[PDB]
Amino acid sequence: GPVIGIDLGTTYSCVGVFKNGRVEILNNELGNRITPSYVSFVDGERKVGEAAKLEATLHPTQTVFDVKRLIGRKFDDQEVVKDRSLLPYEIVNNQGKPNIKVQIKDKDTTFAPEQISAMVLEKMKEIAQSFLGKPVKNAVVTVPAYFNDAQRQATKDAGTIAGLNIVRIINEPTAAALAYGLDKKEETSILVYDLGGGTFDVSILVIDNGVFEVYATAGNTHLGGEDFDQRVMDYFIKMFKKKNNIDLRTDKRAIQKLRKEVEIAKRNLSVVHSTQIEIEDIVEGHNFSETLTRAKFEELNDDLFRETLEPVKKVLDDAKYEKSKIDEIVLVGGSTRIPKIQQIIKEFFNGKEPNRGINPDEAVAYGAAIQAGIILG
Numbered sequence: 001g002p003v004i005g006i007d008l009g010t011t012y013s014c015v016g017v018f019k020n021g022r023v024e025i026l027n028n029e030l031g032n033r034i035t036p037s038y039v040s041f042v043d044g045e046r047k048v049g050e051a052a053k054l055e056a057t058l059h060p061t062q063t064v065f066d067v068k069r070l071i072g073r074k075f076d077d078q079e080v081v082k083d084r085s086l087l088p089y090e091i092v093n094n095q096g097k098p099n100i101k102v103q104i105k106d107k108d109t110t111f112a113p114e115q116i117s118a119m120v121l122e123k124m125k126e127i128a129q130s131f132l133g134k135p136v137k138n139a140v141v142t143v144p145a146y147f148n149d150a151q152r153q154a155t156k157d158a159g160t161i162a163g164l165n166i167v168r169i170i171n172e173p174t175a176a177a178l179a180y181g182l183d184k185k186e187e188t189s190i191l192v193y194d195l196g197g198g199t200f201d202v203s204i205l206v207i208d209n210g211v212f213e214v215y216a217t218a219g220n221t222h223l224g225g226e227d228f229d230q231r232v233m234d235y236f237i238k239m240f241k242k243k244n245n246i247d248l249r250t251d252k253r254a255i256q257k258l259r260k261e262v263e264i265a266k267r268n269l270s271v272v273h274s275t276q277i278e279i280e281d282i283v284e285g286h287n288f289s290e291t292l293t294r295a296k297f298e299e300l301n302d303d304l305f306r307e308t309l310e311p312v313k314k315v316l317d318d319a320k321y322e323k324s325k326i327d328e329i330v331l332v333g334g335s336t337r338i339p340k341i342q343q344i345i346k347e348f349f350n351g352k353e354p355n356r357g358i359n360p361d362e363a364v365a366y367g368a369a370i371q372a373g374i375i376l377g
């Protein structure tokens with residue numbers, strides 16, 4: 001039958017299909033090409049995607065997300081210890097492995113990470129089925145280049161639970177390289193700079209006569225666009241307290257409304273120099289009305305932007321490469337749309353321009369759908 005392509009991201013997923021020589025990245029039921037990797041277990045209903053993410057504000061212990069950080073790992077791994085301290089839903093030790101515990105109609109219910117990832121995959125599968133008007137039983141699914149066999153197998157198991165045979169796992173840098181059509185002839189060294197909503201990954205990908213190999217990987221598992229929004233949140237929470245004697249952190253609903261407008265303002269500031277952040281009655285009887293400039297957006301985040309170069313230096317050192325050896329730079333993730341990020345990368349590479357796309361959050365799924373096409377011939 002069909003083989004679809006799915007980017008199973010830390011913060012979001014994305015599904016493409018390959019049909020009539022075209023890749024189509026598909027809209028979810030809300031009209032969006034990326035779906036938050038969230039599942040909520042509230043009041044006897046299970047929700048997946050944006051409807052689940054919206055439950056996080058009032059039901060933080062029931063709203064599961066970032067399960068990609070746990071999948072195929074051990075409970076005592078230092079990364080999983082840090083993630084348990086950050087994540088609001090209960091994580092329990094099941095015979096050495098992290099499991100997620102929530103309540104369904106008050107009953108304690110414990111899921112493997114792959115069971116929660118399966119729910120995300122099932123939703124992506126259903127989008128493909130509605131679009132193709134036929135069942136889908138097969139997929140290409142992406143993983144991070146640094147995933148080990150246990151992490152890849154757990155991802156395959158998520159597919160099996162979702163009724164998907166994962167015919168091939170490909171790494172996220174290879175998927176991006178396919179999407180951008182990087183010339184497969186001869187030898188090319190590529191720096192894949194992938195700055196998403198929650199995670200930063202850098203890879204040196206070598207393409208040699210059609211063979212893809214990731215020579216080195218490095219990153220920052222807690223650096224992404226959400227952190228840039230939080231720097232802005234922190235600044236306007238201080239300001240609103242100074243002006244109004246209201247600490248917005250005292251009202252969870254106010255924080256949720258602020259985060260949504262700050263994310264919009266941040267995106268506007270990739271295009272314009274100044275934008276208004278407006279929320280009527282952010283609490284009852286008090287409007288939020290602020291201007292944010294690109295300059296202040298950059299000042300609030302400059303240290304985090306510059307931090308992204310530390311993994312770039314590490315992979316060049318791991319690969320024993322000089323900057324000159326990189327032939328092209330491919331940007332992945334919505335956060336690479338920030339002008340200052342591009343300028344910092346361009347400048348580090350002693351002036352060389354980074355290659356980039358137009359829909360960098362869809363490039364991985366697009367390449368997974370190409371891989372699906374390559375496998376069908």
Ligand SMILES: C/C(=C\CNc1ncnc2c1ncn2[C@@H]1O[C@H](CO)[C@@H](O)[C@H]1O)CO
Binds near residue numbers: 198226263267270271
């Ligand atoms: C219109 C245009 C640029 C404006 N867009 C963006 N500017 C900055 N960050 C962005 C943008 N798009 C997605 N992200 C983040 O990417 C992460 C992964 O979803 C999330 O943190 C998003 O906030 C120029 O084409």
